Amino acid sequence: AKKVQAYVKLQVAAGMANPSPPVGPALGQQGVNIMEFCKAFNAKTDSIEKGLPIPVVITVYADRSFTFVTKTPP
Amino acid sequence: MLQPKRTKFRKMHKGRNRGLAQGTDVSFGSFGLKAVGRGRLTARQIEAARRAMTRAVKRQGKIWIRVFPDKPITEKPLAVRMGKGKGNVEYWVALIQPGKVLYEMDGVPEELAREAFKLAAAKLPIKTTFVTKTVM
Amino acid sequence: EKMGLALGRLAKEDPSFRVWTDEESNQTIIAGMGELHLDIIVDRMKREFNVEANVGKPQVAYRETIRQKVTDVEGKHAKQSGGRGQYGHVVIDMYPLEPGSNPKGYEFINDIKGGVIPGEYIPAVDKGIQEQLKAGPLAGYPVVDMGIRLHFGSYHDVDSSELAFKLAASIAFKEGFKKAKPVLLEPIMKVEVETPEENTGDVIGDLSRRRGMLKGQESEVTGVKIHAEVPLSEMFGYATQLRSLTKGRASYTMEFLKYDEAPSNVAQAVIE
Amino acid sequence: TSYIGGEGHNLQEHSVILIRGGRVKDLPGVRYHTVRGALDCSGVKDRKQARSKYGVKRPKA
Amino acid sequence: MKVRASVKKLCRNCKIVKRDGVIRVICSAEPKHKQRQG
RNA sequence: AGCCAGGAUGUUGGCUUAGAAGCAGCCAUCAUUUAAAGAAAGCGUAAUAGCUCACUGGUCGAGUCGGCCUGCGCGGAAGA
RNA sequence: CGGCGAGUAGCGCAGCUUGGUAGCGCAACUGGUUUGGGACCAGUGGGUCGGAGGUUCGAAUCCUCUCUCGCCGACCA
């Protein structure tokens, strides 16, 4: 992740899937395919605890590949 | 919209606005709008300035309006030859003399009180100034 | 007539061009693919078919309701002429229906124990109000959310026909309507906007400027889908506007969903 | 003003209908009839008896 | 611009210069703030 | 004062949860990392992002900045 | 508008002249008479006096000020 390379800064529920409705224009704001990520979003989000809002970081290149970072559920 | 509640005499003379003002110290509050001007301050001019400070405090403050109008002023219907006695009362006015304290804001911070007076004062006719509390 | 045969036939050249019917105004509703399309159509017949029917703009619905409930409005009838001394009185208690989904926006519960009102007169009291549903005493309009309860009545034992009681409801209905202040409502439109990527920001302006409330904001790979509900009346001409501010790279879908209590500023307009 | 037989229809207020004779003895002034099965006023909806009147094409089944 | 008896430092970059004896406002790049007649 | 620079963390701090991500609005106006940094004085968005400021370090290198009280001036100021 | 005159039950009018305690009529309600309605025949409730303020022990009432509605004029160039 660069300083800011159009990366989402909040998240969606820890156990839920398809972050489509709530954030809306912002997740796909980079053209991020929900397809490629939603399968892996829960991969390390279902990992610790489900349903407890956690913060995630998804910073995508122009070469279109992200870096996965998560922080403490607020 | 202050107005003497059932005074004795319906109409009264013109009088003269002279001398230095008497109520000249911050009675209750810490801040005040003391009038440097010298002139007749009507009732409407009172209400306008009041609400215009009521908003700067937004709800939170105690405000005392020192001056009371208490003086009836008369007029003449706009089609009459001069005669036929004293006219009709139209509005009330509180005489002012330089040095008279008019409003008081106590409790709110200084600058907002400073900011507050400006809004209202702009509605007042006579020039006024910002005063702060003194002991004795 | 020269329009009925024209636009009737004018439905064949462009089956994308629609001819319709104003609910109870019958004024022909015209649906096309833009003012350009319509305008051309206007003059396409101005001389080809000499069609001078001055098409204008659509018309509103504006149905009505009641602000609140009533307590005990009473309306009697004193036609004691002789031999047929019409005598009919009811004590109705009208209550607005709270937003539901029963196909009929109405609820009439019969609160009479009989004797106070002979039974076979239920339909009378019933349809008595049913008449007053086409006379909205603001501008003569239909009403919604209407819910009526009846407390008691009064009759005369050589009289009191259905006529006596069809009117008792006819009269006392507006009474509570008078007591319980009415209001003017309007259809609210469910719109699913579609504007690529950028104008998304700028599109919101008209979306909201016509007093429309953005419900859902969504997106996809190269697109955006937005949700909001906005009054039908305050939505005309939008086909032009939407493409007029997005380079035509946008379109939308629209449908009615609900009626709501419009403000008075709106209200003092339908008076006519 | 005419009579509209056929217990309902589909058309109204802008069309071409076809009249015939036939008073009604039941309404003031009315003395005529439309023709169920004619141009715009259709053959009635799925009836069997006396269907020649009311222009019902014989149900193929 | 605008004409008015009283001009003021509206925004962060408002400027005032006594150009030829006239008071006026030149912000930086904020067009809607140009004033004179001070 | 310029020219070079940093200007962040939990953390969108809950609600009206449609969104109030340092900035529509409300309450608190926290506490850590500290040469420093307000969970914010402002611009910009649907919301982010983005450009700065508060404040703090380098260089140059001396005085400089904000109120009060007066005197004398400018604007406000168009008629046959 | 100035100049005088009414504001009374539901509706319309007496009582105000000179201060003490508001009457009549059709209406409304209940019963009688009739097969029933009307008319008719017997009882009853209903204002407490337009409002603000004084005069006095006490005010529909005597004064003074507004508001509603009326009659009169707002003329000589």
From Swiss-Prot, chain A:
N6,N6,N6-trimethyllysine, modified sites: 3, 39
Disulfide bridge map: none
Annotated signal sequence range: none
One GO molecular-function entry: rRNA binding
N6-succinyllysine: residues carrying this PTM: 71
Keyword Ribosomal protein: yes
UniProt keywords, alphabetically: Methylation, Ribonucleoprotein, Ribosomal protein, RNA-binding, rRNA-binding
GO cellular component terms attached to this protein's record: cytoplasm; cytosol; cytosolic large ribosomal subunit
N,N,N-trimethylalanine: modified positions: 1
Presence of the UniProt keyword Nuclease in the record: no
Stated family: Belongs to the universal ribosomal protein uL11 family.
Quaternary organization: Part of the ribosomal stalk of the 50S ribosomal subunit. Interacts with L10 and the large rRNA to form the base of the stalk. L10 forms an elongated spine to which 2 L12 dimers bind in a sequential fashion forming a pentameric L10(L12)2(L12)2 complex.
Protein name, as recorded: Large ribosomal subunit protein uL11
Organism: Escherichia coli (strain K12)
Taxonomic placement: Bacteria, Pseudomonadati, Pseudomonadota, Gammaproteobacteria, Enterobacterales
Gene assigned in the entry: rplK
Part of the whole protein covered: 2 to 75 of 142
From Swiss-Prot, chain B:
Annotated InterPro entries: Ribosomal_uL16, Ribosomal_uL16_bact-type, Ribosomal_uL16_CS, Ribosomal_uL16_dom, Ribosomal_uL16_sf
The record's account of how the chain is modified after translation: Is hydroxylated on Arg-81 by RoxA. The modification is nearly suppressed when E.coli is grown in anoxia.
Pfam families in the record: Ribosomal_L16
Molecular function terms, GO-annotated: rRNA binding; structural constituent of ribosome; tRNA binding
BP terms from Gene Ontology: cytoplasmic translation; ribosomal large subunit assembly
Residues that bear (3R)-3-hydroxyarginine: 81
Gene Ontology cellular-component annotations: cytoplasm; cytosolic large ribosomal subunit
Residues annotated with N-methylmethionine modification: 1
Keywords assigned by UniProt, alphabetized: Hydroxylation, Methylation, Ribonucleoprotein, Ribosomal protein, RNA-binding, rRNA-binding, tRNA-binding
UniProt superkingdom: Bacteria
SUBUNIT field: Part of the 50S ribosomal subunit. Cross-links to the A and P site tRNAs. Interacts with assembly factor DarP(YjgA).
Family, as annotated: Belongs to the universal ribosomal protein uL16 family.
Known function: Binds directly to 23S ribosomal RNA and is located at the A site of the peptidyltransferase center. It contacts the A and P site tRNAs. One of the last ribosomal proteins to be assembled in the 50S subunit. The simultaneous presence of uL16 and bL36 probably triggers ObgE's GTPase activity and eventual dissociation from the mature 50S ribosmal subunit. It has an essential role in subunit assembly.
The name this protein goes by in its record: Large ribosomal subunit protein uL16
Gene: rplP
UniProtKB/Swiss-Prot annotation, chain D:
Modification sites for N6-acetyllysine: 45
Signal sequence extent: none
Top-rank lineage group of the source organism: Bacteria
Modified residues (3-methylthioaspartic acid): 26
Family: Belongs to the universal ribosomal protein uS12 family.
Physiological role: With S4 and S5 plays an important role in translational accuracy. Interacts with and stabilizes bases of the 16S rRNA that are involved in tRNA selection in the A site and with the mRNA backbone. Located at the interface of the 30S and 50S subunits, it traverses the body of the 30S subunit contacting proteins on the other side and probably holding the rRNA structure together. The combined cluster of proteins S8, S12 and S17 appears to hold together the shoulder and platform of the 30S subunit.
Subunit: Part of the 30S ribosomal subunit. Contacts proteins S8 and S17. Interacts with ArfA. May interact with IF1 in the 30S initiation complex.
Additional remarks: At least 19 substitutions or deletions in 11 codons can promote streptomycin resistance, dependence or pseudodependence; all but one of the streptomycin resistant mutations (K42R) are associated with hyperaccurate translation and thus reduced translational efficiency. The streptomycin sensitive allele is dominant to resistant alleles.
UniProt name for this protein: Small ribosomal subunit protein uS12
Taxonomic lineage: Bacteria, Pseudomonadati, Pseudomonadota, Gammaproteobacteria, Enterobacterales
Residues represented out of the complete protein: 64 to 124 of 124
Swiss-Prot record, chain E:
Keywords: Ribonucleoprotein, Ribosomal protein, RNA-binding, rRNA-binding
Superkingdom: Bacteria
One Gene Ontology MF term: rRNA binding
A GO cellular component entry from the record: cytoplasm
NCBIfam families: rpmJ_bact (TIGR01022)
PANTHER family tied to this protein: 50S RIBOSOMAL PROTEIN L36, CHLOROPLASTIC, LARGE RIBOSOMAL SUBUNIT PROTEIN BL36C
Subunit structure: Part of the 50S ribosomal subunit.
Protein name, as recorded: Large ribosomal subunit protein bL36A
Biological source species: Escherichia coli (strain K12)
